[PDB]
Every structure is written in C-alpha cells, then in structure tokens.
C-alpha cells in the first residue's frame, strides 16, 4: 500500500501547552508545480553571498523610482546603491519615502530630506515673518509621499501633516493639519495606498483622498469613511504592501494579535493557529519592534515578518490548500534569520544583515549564507497507523550542483514532541543527477509516527513528494 | 466496523418538555484542525490565575486606545491596570467609552468623565448666563464616542445627545438633541459602528451619521434609513462588537429572544434551537441583566454571553458545520462561570471575577481557576443501533501536561436523559506523552446509547476524534 | 496499458540551479481542438518567405487606419507598403502613432510628423511672437494619438504633452502640460486604451480622460484614480494591446519582472515560474530593450515577446489548462527568432527581419524561413515509472505537404537534463497522407524518462496525441 | 458495441496546409431536439420556389415598418412587394433605411428618398439664400434612421450627418456635422442600435445618443465612450442585427478577420478556426464586398454571410456544444448559394437571387431551388480505431414526401482528405414513412475512417443520430 506523505506543513504537539501545533517547514518554500507523482515540491530558500561591505547594520530599504536606484540606510550612512550619499543619525529602524526632488528618511523624530544635489534640509515651521500658518510639528513617526507631498504623523498623536508644493522643506502654507479623529486612536503608522493616504491608528485604519480644493485654508484631504477598516497595526513598522494592498499585524487593542490583509475595507485573517500562537508568545514591546516586508521571485509572493526571535514567511502563491508559513533561520540552532530588508534591484535581489555590517545578494544556486552552512527542516504530519509496518520511504531530490554529498538526518517520532535516532542518508551527490533518497526498513508504526527530514548543506535542496510503503 | 463518534455537539432528550435538545460541550472549545483521523479536536478552556487583587467585583472593562492601557471598573473604585485612578459610585454594571482627553464611565444615570490629569467632571447643561441652548438631560443609560463627541441616551426615552467639541463636559452648543423616532421605541443601548452612531431601541436598530453641517442649529447627525435593522437588544448590555458588526439578543417585543448578528441592514440568527430555548427559559428582568461580549484568543472568535444562570459561548471559527455553542461553568455543580469582562492586554488576557474581588489572567497551560478543580463535559449524540455490540472506545488525548494522572468518568445512557454507571479511565499521566485513553467491553447497544465523557482536572484536556468499534 | 503523454508543455530539471523548469515547446503552437483521440494538436509556426527587399533592419510597424495601408520603418528609411515615403534618422527602435492628417514616428527624441502630402514637420514650441504659452518640450520618448491630438512624454520626466487641434505641429495653445504625479515615477511609455490616455510610469500606471473643458487654460485631461494599476513597464517598448487591454512586463521597481495583463485596474500575472525565471535571467539594460507585440491568426491570439536572447510567445486561446508559452527560434542552434514586427495587411501577414534588410510574409504551407531549415522541438513531461517497460510510442502526424521525406530525431532522457541516443524516424513523406510515426521497443524506464521530439524540416509538422504502451 | 457518430460537424485534413479543418455540413441545419436515441437531428435547408419575376438581380431588402410591407431593390428598379414604385440607378449593393414619410436607398453616393406619395427628392445642402448652415455633404456610404432623422456617413471620411426634422430632404438646420474622432478611422458603415447611432469605423465601433439640447447650434448627438468596441467591420455591408446586437466581420486592421458579436461594449468571437481560415482565404477587396444578414425561422437563429465563393451560416440555437456553421451551396459543384437578401413577410419568407432576375419564397416541404436538384453533405468526424471492424451503419431518415426514392451516396475515407467508393443507398421512398437507411459490411478500419453522407434530391432530407456497430 504505497501511501504518500505531505511535507508542506508538519504537525505535532507542544510540550508546554499540550496543544497540537503546526511544525512549519524551515528554510523551505513550497512550490505548487505538478512534479512527478505529487502536486508540489519543496525548494530551499536562496542563499546569501556578500556583494560588498557597508557601514553598520541595515535599518531600511527603499527603491527610489525617481533615480531608478535603490537607497539603503545602513548604520549611520545613507548609502545609495554602493556609494555613500549622506550622514544619518540614530540607531533604530527608520522609514523612508523617496521623492522626485529629494530622498528623505524619517529619523530621530524629524523628517530629514537628502536633496539630490547634495544639500540636506529638515522639516520645520515656516519663518515667523513669512506670514504663513504656524503649526506644532512635534516628533515624526512614519512618512510617505503622494502627489508631491510628504505625509508624516506627529508621534504620540493622531495628527498628520503634508508639505508645501513649492518648498518641500516646510509644511503646507495654509492647510497642513489633519486628524484621524474617527476614533481616539493615535496614528501608529502612515502610508500610501493607490491614491489614498492611509492612517494606521492604534485601533482603526482610515483612508484619505484629495478633495481638489483651491481656496486657501480648505482641507486638501477629506476622510473616506466607506473604506475604514476596524483593525490596526501593532507597531510602527508592522505594515507593508502585499498583493495590491497592505498586510499588517493586528494591534492588541482589538484582540489577540494576528496577521491580516486589507480587502475592500475589511480585514481577512491569513494566519493559522500556530502563527497566531507564536505571535502571541511575544510581549508588547518586543512585538512592536517587529518589521514585515514583501519579497517576490520565481513564482512566490512572500510576506516576510521579522519578529525578534522568529522570521515567519507567508507564500501567497502556495496557499492553495490553506495558509503556508515557513520559519526561516540562520545557523544550526534557533538563531534569527540574518537577512533583512530585501529589495530587488537590476538583475538580482540584495538583502541587508541584522548582525554584520554587510549587504548580501540572493544567489539561487547555493543555500549557504555568507559562506556558512544552514539547516533545512521538513516535518511530515502525524498520522495514526496501528500495528502497521513501513519499509520503503523515498523522497525525490533534485541531485545536482553541490560541494559535497551532503547527507540528511532522517528521524521519526512516536508522540509528536521528541524524536528518535537520527539516520544519515545521502541527499545530494556532487554532479550526479539521478540519485534517489531511499530508506528501507523504517519499522513498525505502533500508535503514531512523524518523520523529520533535517539537511545540513551549502547547496540547494529540492525535496519532492514523500513516498512511504505502509505495508 | 470502526465507526467514529462526533463530540463537538451532544444530543439528547429533555425530561421536562420531552423535546430533543442539544447537550452542549462544557468548558471545551472545538478547533477545526485536521488532527490524526479526525477533522477537529476538543480543547479545554484556558484556566484562570490571579494576577493581583481588586476592590469589589468587576463591573466593566474597556481598552483605552488613547493611553494604550486597559481601564477596569471593579466594585466602587475605578482601576487603570494595576494602579487606581478614580472613585466610581453605584454597584451595577457600568458602560464605558474612552476618550482622547478623558475616560468616562456612565454610572447611576450620569455620565462621569475621569480626565487624564486627575480631575473629574460630570455632564450638565451649559450655564444659564452663557446663552447656549438648554436641554433636559435626564438620566444616562448607555454611552459611546465618535469623532471627539460623547453620545449618551436619556433613560426611558428615545432621545440621545452629543457633547460639545470645545468643552466636553457640557453637551453641544446649539444642536445636541437627537431622536430615534422611526418607531415609538425607547433607546435600550447606544454604540459606534464604523462612522455610525447606532441607537439600539426596543423594536428597531437605527443608524446615524455626520452630515457635516456648518451653520449653527443644524442637525449634525442625520438618520440612515437604508441601514435600519428591524430587531432590538433585550437589555442595555446585550450587545457587543463581533466580526466587524454587532451581535445581540433579540428583544421580546419582536418575538422570542434569540442571538442575532447584524449584516447589511438585516439580522441573521446564529442561535440553535437549544440555545434559544435556554434563553427563553429566563424571565424578562433576569435576561435583561445579561451582559454579552467578545473574546478572541488563538484563532477562535468567541462571543461570550453572561446569562444569570448560564454562560453561553459562540465560537465563530468552529461554526463550519453549524453554530457551535459551549456552556462554560465554574465548580463541580451548575454554578455560573466566574470569569467576566475579558480583555486582551499586553501579552496575556485578563478577566474579572463575578464573586470574588480579584482579577484573573488567562493561563493556557492549566485549566484550574484560581487554584481550584473544574469539570469538563463532552457528550456524543444519540445514535440508533439495534442488537449491536461495541468494544473499543478510544478518544485520542494529548497527555503530558498535568500534576496527577487525572482520570475521566466515562458513562453511557440508554434513553438520553439519565446515565448509567460511571467508569474511571486515566486521561492524563503527569509528563507521559503517549498514553491512549482506551476502554474495551462497552457492551450491547440495545436501542440507543449516548456517551458522556467527564473530566475533573487542574490541567488542560485535549480530546480528539472518538472511535467506537460497533461490531 | 496504452497511456497518453501530453506535449503542450515539457518539463525537466535545470542543471545550474538544480530546479525543475518547464521545457517549452519550440516553434510549436498548441491548438485546443478535439483531434482523433486527443484534446489538442501541436502545430508548427508558419514559415517566412521574402516578399520584397527593404533598406536596413526593421524598427517598427503600425497599420495606418487613415490610409488603410501599413507603414513600416526599416533601417534609416520609412516605407509605406512597397514605396518609400520619407527619410527617418536614427538606428534604434521607433514608436509611431498614425494620424488622419499625418503619419508620425517619434525618433531621436523628437516627434517627427510625415504629412500625407509629402512635407515633413517636427514638433516645436509656438513662435515667441505668436503669444501662446511656451513650454519646455525636452526629448520625446513615446507617442500616441487620441481624438486628433498627439500625446508624447518628455524623456526622463513624468510630464506628457498634447498637440493643438488646428496646427498639429506645435503643442496645444494654452493647456499642453500634464503630469503623472500620483507617484514620483517617470513615464516609461504612453499609449491609448479606449478613450483613455494611459501613462506607464516606472512604478505606476495612470489613466487620463478628456474633461471637455471649454475655457482657455483649463486642463483638458484629468486623472482617473479609480483605474490606476500599481505596476509598471520594464522598458519603453515592453507594452502592447492584447485582448482589449495592455499586457506588459513588470518593472523591477515593484519586484521581479513578470508578464502581466491589466484588468479592471488590476494586474493579473500570466507568466509561469519558468517564464519569469527566464525574464529574470536578463540584466536591467538588456531587458529594457525588449519589445513585445500582439499577433493574431487562425484561432491563436499570440503575445510575442522579443527578448535579446529569447522570443517568448503566449497563446491566449491555448491557455485552457494554464499559461502556454512557446519559445520561437531561428536556425539549428539557439539563435534568436529573426521575424520581428508582425502585422496583418490585406490577405497575408508580413514581418520584418532583425538581421537582414528584408521583409517576410508568413506562409502557412511551409515552415522554412527565407528558404532555410528550422528546428521544431517537443518535450514530454517527466513521469515516474519504476521497473516498467514501454514498447509502442506513436505520435499522429499530418503527412504529405513536405518536400523530402524528412525525419525526426526521437530521444529519451533518464535524469531530465541530458539525453540519450537520437533515434531517426520518418515523420513526413512527400505526398503520402496516411503515414504513422511509430517506434517500438523503447525500453525499460528505470526511474524516470522524458522524450524529446526534434524535427528538422522545411515543411509544416503537425504532431497530435502521443500514446505510449507502458506495459 | 453500438457506437454513435456525431454528424453536426465533420473533421478532416486540408491537402494544401496539412492542417486539421472542420468539414462543415452542407445545406443542413442541426436542430437541438431529443430525437429517438440522439440529442439532435440534421434538417435540410428549405428549398426556393419562384414567387414572381423581377428586374435584374437583388441588391437590397428591408421590411418597411411604416407601410407594413417589404421594399426590395432588384437590378435597376425599386420594388414594393409585387408592385414597382421607384427607379434606382447604380448596379452594386444598396443600403436602405425606411422612414415614416419616405423610403430611402443610399445609392451611387447620394441618399435618394422615395416619398410615399410618388415624388423623389435627394439630399442636398440648404439653399444659400435660406440662411441656414452650409456643409460639405460629399458621397453617401451607409444610411440609417432614428427618431425621425436620416443618418449617413460621408464616404472616405469619419464624418456623418443627420437630416432636419421639418424638411427631411436637407440636412439639419444648424447642427448636422458629427465625427467619430475617437480614433483616426473612417466610418465604414452606420446603423441604429436601440436608441444609439453606431459609427462602425475601421478600428473602432463608436456609439452616439441624443443629448436633448434645445439651443441652436448645440450638438444633438454626444459620444458614449463607455460603450466603445475596439474592433471594426471589414466592409460596408459586413454587419447586421443579431440577437439584440450587431454581429460583424473584423476589419484586417485589428488582425485577421473573424466573425464577432458586440456585447456590453466588447467583441466576443463566434468563428471557429476553420471559419476564419475560410474568411482569411479571401483577399481584402473580395472579402470587403461580402454582405451578411440575419434570417430567423422555426427555432433557428441563422446569421447568413454571403462571401464571394462561400455562404457561411451561423445557427445560434444549435450552438449548445460550440459554434455551428453550415456552408450553403447551389448546384452539384462548388457554386455559390443563389438565395440572397432573405426577409420574412406575411406568411412565408422571400429571398432574392444572385444570378437570375427573380424572387424566391422559401418552401419547407421541398429542398429543390427553382425546380432544380441540390446537394446535401454530411461528414462524420475522424476517429481512430485500430484493427476494428464495422458492420451496421444506420442513419435515421424521416422518409416521407418525395418525388423519387432519391438514394444517398455513402463513402468512407482513410486519410481524411480523399474518399473511396461511393455506395448508393435508398434514403427516402416516396409516400413511405418507415424505411430505414441501413448499410451492413462496412469493412475494417486500418487506422482512421470518416464517413461522408451525400444526398442528391428535390425533397427534404432529415437525417438523425448515426450509429455504427464497431465490433
């Protein structure tokens, strides 16, 4: 009785809560492609190779459409491409909003514009003798640009401003004060949808649109109640464009945090039970510092979430049978993924580093990260067979490019928490394309069994449909 | 013939009316997850552990978005998290509506605002010498906030007011009187949905929205007839947000009360026959005092109803095959669940207590409440087998988190009302993860049979698909 | 066990990345027709025969509706049908926009109009003494016509202009400056859809419509935000009408480039994983120079993409089971397809040439291109058969139009990358209409097998359902 | 194994291109009726019998609603039913547009109105001394009427006019010039849909509707961009009403011509591959002269296309399994169908003649045309049977009215192009209603076989489900 075993999502218990939890694939990306005898094949995450050095750790990335080059802020220097093009202060994550005449990075509570000719100007009130309206700027939290104006929100308050059209340094001449007052919620983050200035409050999401008013003093932007979403973003950087909309992480006010996607003025969950438990496992301040972003290559639509001790990835194209989350990791143990701030420039993707002061470019023919080994895990779900035997256990591997015949550790559990002996089986062979990963004499499934495939290698691993002969 | 038995909803007779009624699972939450050989597993409700003390019993909870902390009114003293800010009179349940410059709690018929700098002001008419319009405020019943205004309804009348923008203590300067006059129904409760002030009456649910009028004396809020719902809330606190809308309990005016959800200006029932019989079992005054609320943890979307002698819970995520209701209870006998006013703050949920003067935080690795044993029930539906025999009765359990090998009492009925001998079978074993709960030699199903699984424990119980070998 | 083998899309590994990739049919067009025992038959691309000569290589084509004849710009000379109707400078690809009173070709950064009476005029500002508004025209990138006006976009800037109604040479009298300022994205290309002037930015797509204003100085065109598409075109010529809309290649700013189609203000992908990997294999500049166009004949609605080293073709009518891409090629080795700028005029299609200074007309009864042999490839997908034997391998071919009895080289692989011995089987016989292409004694499939059908001929090859007797 | 053979559409090869093409039923109309053991029965086209004579060949037909009689223009003489009213010059096809006070026929580039009282007036500009606006009428191409105005298009230009309400001879007093300027396409034809004047161009299909303007000089008709269709009619008379819309043939400007139907501002193809191959087999001028029209009788919705060497018919009601086209023909060889300009008047349909100077009325109890024999063909699709035998070959015929026991020629092919021996089997017997058309001992199918049923008769032939005992 040849029975197939899925590997796109593994199951198991949780030894603290005693609840069934999803054992997620690690450093793998399920690809819905009709492979051999199965409907999909697991593909290892692309490796990282150092493109060139950089000052400090990475703090932000933005693809400047105006200059057709990527501006990356690492450490304390606003690197454009590879050449340093300015001095930036601070050490925390900073949000940027590129413009046609100036590239800006909201840092240390002030919106700093790095003009394209070299000079640097900071947002401040119009001069008192000028005669234009004077505001109370406060501290800048998040920024965005839409129709030649920079929109930023005062820190700790629901008010947001817009710059003048003529002189971008100062805010608008007469009407530059706007409030997301539909609820008493402070603006955690701001952004730009299709043509709307969203305002991600601590408990609500509002959409603002230009009214086209001409008379001085008239409110340029008017709220669009019909598009309001009754959720929020947990932290300042827990939002990102994803599939022609913004995904985010619900703020604890509305309830237990959970991933979401805005659709037609409504929030739809895309986080499984295990993902929501993992997110809930964090404290408020730790989870607020998390940042999420979008990465796209091959056929996948990733939504990478950079939590302090986890790096969750949502693969939209592989969600045919349900949400598909893979936990990326760096190193042999449970360390956090080093890659951060992925952006696609020119030919190949480039990513920052959380620990080292380097920038890495994704390379698809290897899985090593900065010339180091990495761990790829695959768990099959628990299935109940009583007094049965299993002998043939074959997984199709795309044997090929490699540096050594890196063997995989294959182990099986019986209670779904702790595992048995680790059996070593060759998975790749350098420059051999027809090896089969086959193990015989698995044994007797007494009550339950779950197989964990663990591969330690510097070369891509492509595991396909898992065949077991449950005789 | 290994035949499975569902446990998400038990069925049986009712010895008073002789009607078939749903025997609901007690202190369990069905989770639609594909586990082993079943499509879902029953999970015990999380236990309650005392976080710290409080003065008196809990009377209200509301997550203050402005201050990013939860304000809880226990006994006669208002609490902001651990610290105490304010004294609140009365003894009954109180409705709160947080504001950006003041936290308010409508109590004893007057809307009392607790300003954030320490001072306390109460809503009253503008001074006579001021010159602004004088109203007849009357007694305050329910309150809400929307766009910087507090909306409260005069007790025993369909009129509701709004406070001034400049000075929030007094009502609006010129236009502060509004009526839900579409029907001769008094406003039982008020609330805010999106940008709409609801006006839950006794036969209708009217919706209002800002008209944006500028001239003095013009009605700021205008009725939206197209969204009217022809039902009502039975009591002042029988409403709550749920799935981007308000659920409620129908007022007896429109017919027998039943749990409803508002959708696109229409009420759709979500209460089964048994739930609505239980609701109808109460008198008008008793069922009016019931309070209902929303709790969201893990992936479930609970809708907890606090009836005087029952605590019904609607699990939205587990309603795939139909509405799923579980009756929570505290203690070994039919006492009412002590947990009340659940709110998620920071990392972990916190709940008040109906009897003691404490606050409890939900803990997921135990099921004990304030270090006390609790009872979990699971009923399988009645099924007709004639002259058949059943031997194997296995219920997969997630053993391992416990303090003692708490055994379960397994009993089977024959007429669906009263049960037979109670058999004790070990359910958990402390820190053993592969125990099976198996019973052989069940007996002969003569005409009908129904199994009641009863667990008394201080640790979580996770029961899965129940199979019986009806040979 | 006679088992059929699809050939509409071949599948296999990739020896560099070790990833499974689609082996696309080469010089084939799947036709969804119920043929004999199969649901579709593979049809060779029509051949190319030299209609007449031309000066230089082909640079553009446009079917002039006003004169009901095709205008083709080859080399440095503009051609109308057979005749030479003006001199055009430059060497790169040129975009044209035919008009009722002039045929124009935006070349070398200036919009040059070739009036129908012989004279040539170039767009320039109105004379200073005229009194009309003076603009900063800059360099012309892309052009289009709509309601008697020529719309062109300033190179390296998001501004686009419109010509005057009375005198088409100069821009509009008072209002001729328009900007796609919704984002800081430069306009990569312009076009006309329905009555809208699109503006393909480097990161966004905007739709413009006439406002019908009469007063002087009022903006004739107003942006239509509701139709915005949040994607972009890779290069100036990476767009074309396709199925009552524009398809394109995504700019690298929004992520990895991938072929898209605009629908109801939303971009829907039509590129499989292999296609977008092939597209990503190119650098930014190389992929910018790519040009794509639409060709429609028989039942196929092709979307031909002219990449520097590949010619991908999307067959809209054959996408029943998923996107269908065929890689056209010229010569025995991997050279790029010579045919370029296809247009249907009169009775038969005509196409330019990338290398020679000739124009070819598509001829359907041959597959030779300019009297040369061409290669047609067909790959069957990899399928897992263990210890099985295959004897009968038959493909139905429509025989008879050939010149000589051309033969096909049939080979089978075992690892999906490199192939075995090439077996030669007669496929057509000149003027015999009932030959069967049958091969016996294929052999034993050890682990995997994939058949490559390679035909070298000067006559059309029509291969139908492939049956293999996997005994 | 009694296996049924469809006859609604036949399959075969094409000896020139070697492509599989549809062998269409000839002079037959598939009727989707559940007959005996089959889902439909083939019915011969109704025959033509001479009602009375006429002068010259037929050039146009239009059912005059105002006079409740059909006006037919044959040769150089205009006819109203039997009687002869007007005199018409020219020799080519003429477009008519009936009016309440005048019947008009656009001929020789001038719109000529035949008033109902006998006088004849031609459209010309208003007299110079009158004072009304003077236009440049030019040559008339196509005409239509809507709300008391005649709309005609200037030949070789996209401008169209409308006549005055008071005096219909001259165009409108102040506003009679209108342009389909959305594209630089000349108006190939004009027509009226509901209350819209279409302006069928050479690359677009623009619409127009009355604006209801009252002031002199205001444009009465304003464009409706939202209904624009981005296709065109190949020739002046390649359009006709069909199923509450206009079907047409695509102009070569947009690609290869193909029969289309306009729906909700979008063109949907209804032409199979073989139909558009037949259409494309014509040159531009030849296919431009084609005229297409609608005929509706019984349950069929015919859409007859009169191409120079083919007469294609689309039967809408029989398109359940896909488009259904039958090629009508006159005579034993490939001559073109003589019937033209079908119109239903009174009790029975009447049709003109392409060659003779007569008018024929359709008669349903015969298939002879003007007392001549006609040929009906039926091809079964090619199906692959190897080493099989077929003995019983029965087709259900509705034997009945006839003049002689007209036998059918039944032949079978082996390569799908050329056929074998013609076997003669009695199909009808005069005055006998229970004959069966049965042939035994068909033979052995070496690889492929296709049966061609050919009937030469002067009486209707009704062939039903064809069964073959493939033993």
Curated annotation (Swiss-Prot), chains A, B, C, D:
InterPro entries: Phage_P22_Gp10
Main location: virion
Pfam families in UniProt: Phage_stabilise
Entry's transmembrane regions: none
UniProtKB keywords: Late protein, Virion
Localisation: Virion
Subunit structure: Monomer (in solution). Hexamer; assembles as a hexamer onto the dodecamer formed by the head-to-tail adapter gp4. Interacts with the head-to-tail adapter protein gp4; each gp10 monomer contacts 2 head-to-tail adapter protein gp4. Interacts with the tail needle protein gp26. Interacts with the tail spike protein gp9; binds six tail spike trimers.
Function in brief: Acts as a tail hub by assembling onto the head-to-tail adapter protein gp4, generating a channel that is sealed by the tail needle protein gp26. Together with gp4 and gp26, gp10 is required for stabilization of the condensed DNA within the capsid; perhaps by plugging the hole through which the DNA enters.
Protein name, as recorded: Tail hub protein gp10
Name of the coding gene: 10
């Amino acid at each position: 009785p040849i029975q197939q075993l899925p590997m796109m999502k593994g199951m198991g218990k949780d030894f603290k809560n005693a609840d069934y939890i999803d054992y997620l694939p690690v450093n793998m990306l399920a690809t819905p492609k009709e492979i051999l005898n199965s409907s999909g094949y697991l593909r290892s995450f692309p490796g990282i190779t150092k493109r060139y050095d950089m000052n400090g750790v990475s703090r932000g990335v933005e693809y400047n459409t105006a200059q057709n080059a990527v501006y990356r802020v690492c450490g304390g220097k606003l690197y454009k491409g590879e050449s340093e093009v300015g001095d930036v202060a601070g050490s925390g994550r900073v949000s940027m909003a590129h413009g046609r005449t100036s590239q800006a990075v909201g840092v240390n509570g002030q919106l700093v514009e790095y003009r394209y000719d070299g000079t640097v100007k900071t947002v401040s009130n119009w001069p008192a003798d000028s005669g234009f309206t004077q505001y109370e700027l406060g501290s800048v939290r998040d920024i965005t640009r839409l129709r030649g104006r920079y929109a930023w929100s005062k820190d700790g308050t629901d008010s947001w401003f817009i710059t003048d059209l003529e002189d971008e340094s100062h805010p608008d001449r007469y009407s530059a004060q706007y409030r997301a007052e539909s609820q008493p919620d402070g603006i955690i983050g701001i952004g730009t949808w299709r043509d709307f200035i969203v305002c991600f409050g601590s408990s609500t999401i509002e959409y603002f649109s230009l009214t086209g008013a001409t008379t001085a003093g008239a409110a340029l932007y008017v709220a669009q109640p019909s598009l309001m979403v009754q959720k929020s973003i947990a932290g300042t950087y827990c939002k990102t464009p994803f599939a022609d909309s913004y995904a985010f992480i619900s703020h604890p006010a509305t309830g237990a945090p959970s991933v979401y996607i805005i659709g037609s003025g409504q929030a739809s969950p895309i986080a499984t039970a295990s993902i929501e438990k993992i997110i809930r496992s964090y404290t408020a301040e730790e989870m607020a510092t998390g940042v999420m972003e979008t990465l796209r290559f091959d056929s996948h639509e990733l939504l990478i979430i950079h939590l302090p001790r986890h790096v969750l990835v949502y693969d939209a194209s592989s969600s045919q049978n349900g949400p598909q989350w893979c936990v990326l990791k760096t190193g042999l143990y449970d360390d956090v993924y080093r890659g951060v701030d992925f952006m696609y420039e020119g030919n190949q993707i480039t990513c920052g580093d959380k620990s080292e002061a380097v920038v890495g470019q994704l390379q698809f023919d290897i899985s090593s990260q900065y010339d180091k080994q990495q761990e790829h895990l695959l768990f099959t779900p628990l299935f109940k067979a009583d007094n049965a035997r299993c002998f043939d256990l074959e997984v199709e591997s795309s044997t090929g490019v490699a540096q050594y015949a890196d063997r995989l550790f294959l182990s099986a559990t019986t209670d779904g928490i702790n595992y048995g002996r680790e059996q070593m089986i060759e998975q790749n062979e350098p420059f051999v394309y027809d090896k089969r990963v086959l193990w015989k004499r698995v044994g007797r499934i007494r009550r339950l069994i779950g197989f964990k495939l663990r591969v330690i290698t510097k070369s891509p691993v492509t595991l396909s449909g898992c065949q077991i002969r449950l005789e």
